[PDB]
Structure formats: structure tokens, C-alpha cells
């Protein structure tokens, strides 16, 4: 079985959430490959199939559980299991399609959505942009129930789409960015729910090119400034890796060092 990390929304604290996200990072990568002080995810090339995924088992107040599968090469959620049924996003390529057959192999009902697990498609399905989808412990609790009830026809597609958008941000994005982990910690500490601001959205949208820009630069300066946004939406440019080191927890493998 692939490694399993557990988290519950029942009595979640900033400490329990932090421990969770730290454990997710530690399973995503060994931390052996580090560029400009930022750990890199394992290279798809050379990654055996028995080390390809990690499982995040989520529980809530209702004691309902679902298990998300995460690809260690990019921290993307590729599918989930609830009871005796597993659902996978439409794979991006043939190799990924084959890889996911190694997931949840004892489940008797496997399904593949016609849509991939990217924000653009999910937002369309949900009928809402990330900017308008609240995040926090409450939202996660509700997302877990929605995922759990999908197999029994108790969950509408738009709600499923929304729920995925919530889980992805609070798990994957938080894993990728210390800044986003911090934002979720704050929501939790104060028992608040709220949509992510532009600073969060812009980071999520830039993870790929940030990874590239960092691994590309020899001494740590950027040939072309990276544009990001503050909470208030105002744009600001980033000329070197210093500011990014405390913001990014890990990068996707782009090139060799």
C-alpha cells in the first residue's frame, strides 16, 4: 500500500493542520534535491510505480472518510476513494492513465470522469471561480461529506466540483506553498471561512513558471521579473529568489542541477 497521511476536521487546530501538511511534504519528497533552498519534487523519469502516489485520508465531524490520491511528481490530486468506489480525473496522458490503475486496486467500482482536475474546468462545473469559493475547516468538512455521498447519488456535480476545488487548495496548494499553508492556518485559528485573495490565486497560477524560473537561474536572479499580486490585488514584480524562499515549500522538477 502507498503511504497514508491522516487528517480530521473534528477539532482541527493550527497545530494538527501544520503537522498534517508537514507530513504530506515529507511523503511527497525526500528533500534530497534542493535548489536555492527550496525542495524539489522527484523527477517523473526514474520514479518507480510503487513510489508514485501518496494517500490522504480525510475525516470529519460526521466520522465520514474519503481518501485522496496525490501524485508525488506534482502534488496533483488524481482521484479519490469512498467506501467501495473510486473516482479518477481524466488523465492528462497515456502514462498517467496507466499509473492510476495501480491505485485503490481492491475497490470494486472504478470510474473515470470525462474532465481533468484543473481549476478552469472545475470552476466551470462548480459554477464559481476560486475567488468566490470560501476555504477553511467548515468548507473542508462539507467537501468531505459531498465526496463521500457522490457514489450514492446524494451529491450534485456542481457541488462535487466545488468540493474538489476546496480539497485541492487546502491540501495540494498548502503543501506547495508555505504562504498558502499560512493562510489556511489563519482561517483555522480563528474559526473563519473565506475565499482566497489574489495573492493566493496568483501563486497557485504561477507554480509552474516559478519552478522553472528558479531552477533556470544560476545565481538566483531572474532574467525577467516574475509578476505576483498582493492581497489588495496590486501587482508587484519579483527580481530574485530571496523573497520566494519563505513563500514556496516545494517545486516541480524542471531541469537537472
Amino acid at each position, epitope marked *: 500500500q502507498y503511504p497514508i497521511i491522516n487528517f480530521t476536521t473534528a477539532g482541527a487546530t493550527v497545530q494538527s493542520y501544520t503537522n498534517f501538511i508537514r507530513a504530506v511534504r515529507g511523503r511527497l519528497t525526500t528533500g534530497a534535491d534542493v535548489r536555492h533552498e527550496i525542495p524539489v519534487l522527484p523527477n517523473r523519469v526514474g520514479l518507480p510505480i510503487n513510489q508514485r502516489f501518496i494517500l490522504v485520508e480525510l475525516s470529519n465531524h460526521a466520522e465520514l472518510s474519503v481518501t485522496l490520491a496525490l501524485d508525488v511528481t506534482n502534488a*496533483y490530486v488524481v482521484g479519490y476513494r469512498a467506501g467501495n468506489s473510486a473516482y479518477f480525473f481524466h*488523465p492528462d*496522458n497515456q502514462e498517467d492513465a496507466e499509473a492510476i490503475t495501480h491505485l485503490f486496486t481492491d475497490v470494486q467500482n472504478r470510474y473515470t470522469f*470525462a474532465f481533468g482536475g484543473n481549476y478552469d*474546468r472545475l470552476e466551470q462545473l462548480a459554477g464559481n471561480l476560486r475567488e468566490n469559493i470560501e476555504l477553511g475547516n467548515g468548507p473542508l468538512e462539507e467537501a468531505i461529506s459531498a465526496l463521500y455521498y457522490y457514489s450514492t447519488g446524494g451529491t450534485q456535480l456542481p457541488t462535487l466540483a466545488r468540493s474538489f476545488i476546496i480539497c485541492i487548495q487546502m491540501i495540494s496548494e498548502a503543501a506547495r506553498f508555505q504562504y498558502i499553508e499560512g493562510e489556511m492556518r489563519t482561517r483555522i485559528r480563528y474559526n473563519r471561512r473565506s475565499a482566497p485573495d489574489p495573492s493566493v490565486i496568483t501563486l497557485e497560477n504561477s507554480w*509552474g*513558471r516559478l*519552478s*522553472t524560473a528558479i531552477q533556470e537561474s544560476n545565481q538566483g536572479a531572474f532574467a525577467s521579473p516574475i509578476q505576483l499580486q498582493r492581497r489588495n490585488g496590486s501587482k508587484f514584480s519579483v527580481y530574485d529568489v530571496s523573497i520566494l524562499i519563505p513563500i514556496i515549500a516545494l517545486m516541480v522538477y*524542471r531541469c537537472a542541477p
Partner: nanobody
Amino acid sequence: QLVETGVQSGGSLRLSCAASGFTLDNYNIGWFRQAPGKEYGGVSCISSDGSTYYADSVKGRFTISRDNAKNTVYLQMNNLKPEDTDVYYCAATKYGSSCPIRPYDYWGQGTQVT
């Protein structure tokens, strides 16, 4: 930024993907469908070399090309069928395989083809 621009059963179309701010020369570029169904990966891709990839279903019909000058990438779509109806979009990644894998460095909004 990547911006895309560009029919009766059997007709053709020419999709274009223009990059603003940077040059597509050093990027792996791929065209993709919003709903591939039973197939996976790009519709057609070009290496950052300059090999090209084509999905079996479009071989002999589609041709992808680069115009370094104007700094855009073209997708020629001949002998179109009803089943080709979909949203097509442009995605670029600087390193890795000829067909960009998520996460992309850059991608476009995509256009509809019926």
C-alpha cells in the same frame, strides 16, 4: 500570455497561438482538447529541436508548426469530423517532453471548434 485564434464535416481550420512578452522558440508547445474521451495527451506538439508529436486520431490530418518571426504556433486542421468538436487550447512548458505536462508554465484560454 498565450492567445489563441482561428466548419462543415470535411472542412478545415487553422488555429493560432501567439505569445506576448516572451518567445516560444525555447518552449515545448502543445495543443489540447477539453475532453479527449478515450484518448490522452495533446492533439499535436512541437519540441523546444524540432520534433513533432501527433495523436493517432489526427495523424495525416493535422500539422503543427512554428513561426519564430511573428512568434506564434499554428495548428492546421484538415479533414475535420463531428467528433473533433471541442475546446482547443495552447500550453507551453520550457523543459521536459515535447508535449507539455501539467503544471504548465503558460497556457491560453482556448477556442471552440464545432
